[PDB]
Design an enzyme around this catalytic site. Structure first.
Site, PDB file in Angstrom:
ATOM      1  N   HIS A 119      -4.622  -1.524   2.368  1.00 43.59           N
ATOM      2  CA  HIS A 119      -3.728  -0.388   2.598  1.00 43.59           C
ATOM      3  C   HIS A 119      -2.687  -0.751   3.669  1.00 43.59           C
ATOM      4  O   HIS A 119      -2.562  -0.105   4.712  1.00 43.59           O
ATOM      5  CB  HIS A 119      -4.521   0.886   2.914  1.00 43.59           C
ATOM      6  N   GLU A 165      -0.126   1.116  -3.187  1.00 44.22           N
ATOM      7  CA  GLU A 165       1.333   1.167  -3.180  1.00 44.22           C
ATOM      8  C   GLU A 165       2.000  -0.162  -2.808  1.00 44.22           C
ATOM      9  O   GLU A 165       2.638  -0.283  -1.755  1.00 44.22           O
ATOM     10  CB  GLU A 165       1.789   2.280  -2.228  1.00 44.22           C
ATOM     11  N   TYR A 298       4.153  12.299  -5.452  1.00 46.60           N
ATOM     12  CA  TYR A 298       4.557  13.337  -4.518  1.00 46.60           C
ATOM     13  C   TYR A 298       5.713  14.228  -4.941  1.00 46.60           C
ATOM     14  O   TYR A 298       5.685  15.428  -4.664  1.00 46.60           O
ATOM     15  CB  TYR A 298       4.931  12.657  -3.198  1.00 46.60           C
TER      16      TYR A 298
END
Length: 465
Positions: A119, A165, A298
């Protein structure tokens, strides 16, 4: 109705919540270095203390049980495991023991762990040694080793995520310089994306060959972000094309190699030699490497085409990314994040887009949530009454339901970002995404916001049986 086995919970990331940045042998990540550099973080903060979650595992688990979470998505700090990061470097047993205990404690609470290996917190040692994410030879070898260490240490885990991501590791990290390690190049983001994909494939092959449980419920995949697109002028074929091309640069960049076997043709056209070419060996690793599709989502934008060819600094696919269209309509209301305007319909639409392009894979929505404009300036009572966020969740969850029910999308789970307010990268602590308020000034004390309590009754209505 959602299927009876539908999983829902909350998500966090190690550097955003853990603190304890040098406790128990932890080595520095590229994020620790970045925060030490002036002008990188808006409020001049760092993950030094954050929510101190490293030291408050019992409390975090009790909160998850209080809120009725079925699963919990969190990440492992690589530099707690191998401080220098590499396959020839010393392993930190203390860091391993911490996560082993944490997983044991989650499972004893009856909550399923969903674990992210990477991450964004690349050990600083690998960055210094060989250019970190830039190295096509070394990075994938060291990532695979790290993955193997974690697979071996946490054999009760069934749900794994390789990277969170990769676009954010690549573009902000090596393109605009806004995220660690803060580089700026017209080629480096494309190099980085490629090495992440290879690293991912090596890790998945290692999982499948040597660690997947006989019980058969083990799964591994990557997590991709992506916001939906609508043409600025819907009646202009160029804007339809531009909106599609935008999704390709945002998301197909990664998912096309994984599902289809190569990069989007539109990327190859624009980027030419700056976009790497998979070797036969690399394609064998990457093609078919997702057991599930990990989805962070989002917002949405209007997309307008441009009258000229793309420049080398372009990373979006030569389009304008906007909040208003030709008719003066607006995507959604402002939040604390300039990039985030709530638009529930775009969530349904993104789920369908993924499903249609990639053969209706099983999808885990590994992040979804919102900030509230000026939230941090509010008195406590007002922060706790986070009606804007309650409504965000209600509408987005109902849009997901629509995609499942009508469009036949195979959504398997949903994770609210985030369990608590945390270090929001270059924004610092000002931008709050938590369903739980964290008072950083008063010993990081937690206070559940209205939205935290709203998810269980909502999912109890939906999930069958």
């Amino acid at each position: 109705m959602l299927p009876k086995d539908f999983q829902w919970g909350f998500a966090t990331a190690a550097y955003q919540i853990e603190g304890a940045v040098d406790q128990d042998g932890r080595g520095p990540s590229i994020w620790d270095t970045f925060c030490a550099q002036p002008g990188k973080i808006a409020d001049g903060s760092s993950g030094v203390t954050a929510c101190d979650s490293y030291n408050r595992t019992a409390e975090d688990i009790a909160l998850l049980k209080s809120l009725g979470a079925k699963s919990y998505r969190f990440s492992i700090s690589w530099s707690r495991i191998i401080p220098e990061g590499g396959r020839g470097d010393a392993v930190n047993q203390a860091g391993i023991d911490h996560y082993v205990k944490f997983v044991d404690d989650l499972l004893d609470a009856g909550i399923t762990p969903f674990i992210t290996l990477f991450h964004w917190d690349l050990p600083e040692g690998l960055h210094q040694r060989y250019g970190g994410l830039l190295n096509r030879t070394e990075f994938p070898l060291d990532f695979e080793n790290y993955a193997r260490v974690m697979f071996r240490a946490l054999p009760k885990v069934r749900n794994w995520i390789t990277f969170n991501e990769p676009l954010c590791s690549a573009i902000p990290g090596y393109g605009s310089g806004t995220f660690a390690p803060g580089r700026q190049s017209t080629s480096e983001p494309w190099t980085v994306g490629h090495n992440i994909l290879v690293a991912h494939g090596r890790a998945v092959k290692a999982y499948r060959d040597d660690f997947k449980p006989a019980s058969g419920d083990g799964q591994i995949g990557i997590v991709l972000n992506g916001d939906f697109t609508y043409p600025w002028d819907a009646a202009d074929p160029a804007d339809k094309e531009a909106a599609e091309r935008r999704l390709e640069f945002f998301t197909a960049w990664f998912a096309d190699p994984i599902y289809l076997g190569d990069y989007p043709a539109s990327m190859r056209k624009q980027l030419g030699d700056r976009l790497p070419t998979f070797t036969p060996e690399e394609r064998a690793l990457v093609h078919g490497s997702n057991d599930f599709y990990g989805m962070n989502h989002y917002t949405s934008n209007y997309i307008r085409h441009r009258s000229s060819p793309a420049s080398a600094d372009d990373t979006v696919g030569n389009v304008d990314v906007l909040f208003t269209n030709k008719q003066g309509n607006c995507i959604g209301p402002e939040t604390q994040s300039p990039w985030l305007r709530p638009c529930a319909a775009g969530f349904r639409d993104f789920l369908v887009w993924i499903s249609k392009r990639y053969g209706y894979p099983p999808i885990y929505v590994t992040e979804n949530g919102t900030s509230i404009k000026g939230e941090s300036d509010l008195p406590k009572e007002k922060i706790l009454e986070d009606d804007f966020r309650v409504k965000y969740y209600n509408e987005y969850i109902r849009a997901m339901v629509t995609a499942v029910e009508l469009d036949g999308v195979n959504v398997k789970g949903y994770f609210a970002w985030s369990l608590m307010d945390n270090f929001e990268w270059a924004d610092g602590y000002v931008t709050r995404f938590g369903v739980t308020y964290v008072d950083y000034e008063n010993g990081q004390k937690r206070f559940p916001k209205k939205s935290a309590k709203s998810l269980k009754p909502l999912f109890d209505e939906l999930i069958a049986a």
